[PDB]
């Protein structure tokens, strides 16, 4: 049973362009899974402490037959491969962040997983790249991505 998972990518440490390229190769190496498409690379000012570098943000469509937490096990390996240091606070810098934004049309609320990503509808740097690869996207609650964007004051992003 194949599902399309949409994954958000963020990086602002240790050459983000290399970090993201490495993440994309590794994402394709996930078993029972392959990349359908990927957005452009965007350069975004940090949401959080201002004394950190600008981010490279992107979105990826990953077709997969894995269970959601099985996929999470793989995306977390990828973060560690790129030296991600796990921390409690979540707005600081990192080599690589891989978040599952959407997993098919599923709503997931477990100890390890909240899908749709709890804050994605409030982050231009997640929505704009997603819109690039899925302009007709509809969230599980039925809102359209396009309507959200063109309705709220999301400044457009600059490319990397
Ligand atoms: N949709 C999702 N994708 C990835 N991880 C998720 C998730 N929902 C919950 N999590 C959980 O979030 C935990 C911490 O992940 P972190 O990457 O350190 C938070 P972050 O991405 O830096 O900030 P954010 O969640 O505000 O985007 C993971 O161990 C994972 O279990
Ligand atoms: N704090 C932040 N974390 C991640 S993963 N991506 C960002 N883009 C702009 N700010 C960001
Ligand atoms: Mg994140
Ligand atoms: Mg994360």
UniProtKB/Swiss-Prot annotation:
Pfam families: HPPK (PF01288)
GO molecular function, one term: ATP binding
InterPro entries on file: Hppk (IPR000550), Hppk_sf (IPR035907)
SUPFAM superfamilies, per database record: 6-hydroxymethyl-7,8-dihydropterin pyrophosphokinase, HPPK (SSF55083)
Gene3D superfamilies in the record: 7,8-Dihydro-6-hydroxymethylpterin-pyrophosphokinase HPPK
Leader peptide range in chain numbering: none
Pathway: Cofactor biosynthesis; tetrahydrofolate biosynthesis; 2-amino-4-hydroxy-6-hydroxymethyl-7,8-dihydropteridine diphosphate from 7,8-dihydroneopterin triphosphate: step 4/4
EC numbers, comma separated: 2.7.6.3
Database matches in PANTHER family: 2-AMINO-4-HYDROXY-6-HYDROXYMETHYLDIHYDROPTERIDINE PYROPHOSPHOKINASE (PTHR43071:SF1)
Function: Catalyzes the transfer of pyrophosphate from adenosine triphosphate (ATP) to 6-hydroxymethyl-7,8-dihydropterin, an enzymatic step in folate biosynthesis pathway.
Protein name per the record: 2-amino-4-hydroxy-6-hydroxymethyldihydropteridine pyrophosphokinase
UniProt source species: Escherichia coli (strain K12)
Gene name tied to this protein: folK
């Amino acid at each position: 049973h194949m599902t399309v998972a949409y994954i958000a990518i963020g990086s602002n440490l240790a050459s983000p362009l290399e970090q993201v390229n490495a993440a994309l190769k590794a994402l394709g190496d996930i078993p029972e899974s392959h990349i359908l498409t990927v957005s452009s690379f965007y350069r975004t000012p940090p949401l959080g402490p201002q004394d950190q570098p600008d981010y490279l943000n992107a979105a990826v469509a990953l077709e997969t037959s894995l269970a959601p937490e099985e996929l999470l096990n793989h995306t977390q390996r990828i973060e560690l491969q790129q030296g991600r240091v796990r921390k409690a606070e979540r707005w600081g810098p990192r080599t690589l962040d891989l978040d599952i934004m959407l997993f098919g049309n599923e709503v997931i609320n477990t100890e390890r997983l909240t899908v749709p990503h709890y804050d994605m509808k409030n982050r231009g740097f997640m929505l704009w790249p997603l819109f690039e690869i899925a302009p007709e996207l509809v969230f599980p609650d039925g809102e359209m991505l396009r309507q959200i964007l063109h309705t709220r004051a999301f400044d457009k992003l600059n490319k990397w």
